Amino acid sequence: KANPQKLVVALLPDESAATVIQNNKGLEMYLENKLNKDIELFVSTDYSSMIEVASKGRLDLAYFGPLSYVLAKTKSNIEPFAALEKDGKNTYQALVIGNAEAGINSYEKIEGKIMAYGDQASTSSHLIPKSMLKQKQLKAGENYEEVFVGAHDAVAIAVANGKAQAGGLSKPIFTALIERGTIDKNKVIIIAESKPFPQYPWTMRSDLDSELKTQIQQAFLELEDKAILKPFKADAFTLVTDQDYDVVRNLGEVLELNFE
Ligand SMILES: [Mg+2]
Ligand SMILES: [Mg+2]
């Protein structure tokens, strides 16, 4: 188990499994050649399931969301090591979006309506947009109805089709969904955008052989291939450590969220 021949690699189900797998094929092939190991991918049904599988010691690498990383780290022997870098920044934002047909173009128009969030353990499709709504005196179950639709693509689709009047999701995913034709830009209005949060961490099992750990980190750092990272509109990977996610811990405290 310190130097396995094949690596079990989990990817966050932030969108449909097909989409996540397809976007990662380039990276998988690169890493298999760089490391001379076979990679075997796993995409869970939901974020909590991925956390559980990490906590049980089944994974060698895992591409977590920021919040789901913080949660896993409480009960898993894992460490973050890399994150996507774009135009020199290693952060991303959440959006609050509204249904255009219903004229949902401000926070005031959310009141008394349906707000879609993704997975309960989502940073950019739950915690962050919820915080943004709270700062605008909107409170779930008091002056709006919340629905958890389980993923970012599910949020965008729900808002675009008017099943939900507003929603919160990843800015990069929203962009990708528009660029790929999945979402019609004319059917949604951007209401607000969040402050920058740290990018998703790539993580590894901490009891992998120290030489292998370095090889893995170095492999990510060495990647110079805009084509491989094109699905993520990214330049390169940079380094990250556990402390970079303290901002997410702090937000989780602010909102008094109970994952236990
Ligand atoms: Mg493979
Ligand atoms: Mg699911």
If you write DSSP's letter for every residue of 60-104 in order, what string do you get?
A: SEEE--HHHHHHHHTTS-EEEEEEEEBTTB-EE-EEEEEETTTT-
Q: Residue 171: give its domain's CATH number.
A: 3.40.190.10
Ligand nearest to the CA of 122: 2
Residue 187 to residues 89, 105, 180, Cα–Cα distance (Å): 30, 11, 15
Q: What is the DSSP letter of 89?
A: B
CA of 238 to the centre of ligand 1 (A): 23
Query: What are the tokens at 2?
Result: 């310190």
Method: X-ray
CB count within 10 Å of CB 196 equals 13
CA of 4 to the centre of ligand 1 (A): 14
Query: What are the tokens at 5?
Result: 């021949």
CB count within 10 Å of CB 157 equals 18
Beta bridge partners of 97: 167, 190
Amino acid identity for residue 239 in this structure:
L
Which residues place a Cβ less than 5 A from the ion ligand 2?
A: 45-46, 150
Q: What is the DSSP letter of 230?
A: G
Please calculate the CA angle 175-179-183 and round it to the nearest 5 degrees: 80
d(CA 236, CA 45): 28
- Binding residues are 28, 32, 39, 45
CA of 259 to the centre of ligand 2 (A): 18
d(CA 127, CA 138): 14
Pick from 71, 30, 28: which is nearest to 49 by CA? 71
- Binding residues for Mg(2+) are 28, 32, 39, 45
CA of 37 to the centre of ligand 1 (A): 8
CA of 28 to the centre of ligand 1 (A): 6
Beta bridge partners of 205: 78
Query: What are the tokens at 121?
Result: 């353990």
Ligand nearest to the CA of 27: 1
Which residue in the block uniquely carries the two structure tokens 């507003």?
A: 166
Ligand nearest to the CA of 121: 2
For the CA atoms of 18, 85, 188, 137, the dihedral, rounded to the nearest 10 degrees, stands at 120
CB 129 within 8 A of CB 195: no
DSSP codes of every residue in 141-193: TTTBEEEE-SSHHHHHHHHHTTSSSEEEEEHHHHHHHHHTTSS-GGGEEEEEE
Ligand nearest to the CA of 25: 1
CA of 47 to the centre of ligand 2 (A): 8
d(CA 32, CA 230): 19
227-244 burial, b if ≥16 CB within 10 A, otherwise e?
Answer: ebbebbebbbbeebeeeb
Pick from 66, 121, 123, 133: which is nearest to 97 by CA? 133
d(CA 224, CA 208): 25
CB count within 10 Å of CB 36 equals 8
d(CA 123, CA 251): 9
Which residue in the block uniquely carries the two structure tokens 């084509």?
A: 227
Q: Provide the residue range defining the domain that includes 162.
A: 91-193
First to last CA, the chain: 29
CB 183 within 8 A of CB 156: yes
Exposure of 17 in the CB half-sphere (CA atoms within 13 A): 9
Pick from 214, 223, 227: which is nearest to 25 by CA? 227
CB 204 within 8 A of CB 63: no
Tell me the resolution in Å: 1.4
d(CA 159, CA 188): 7
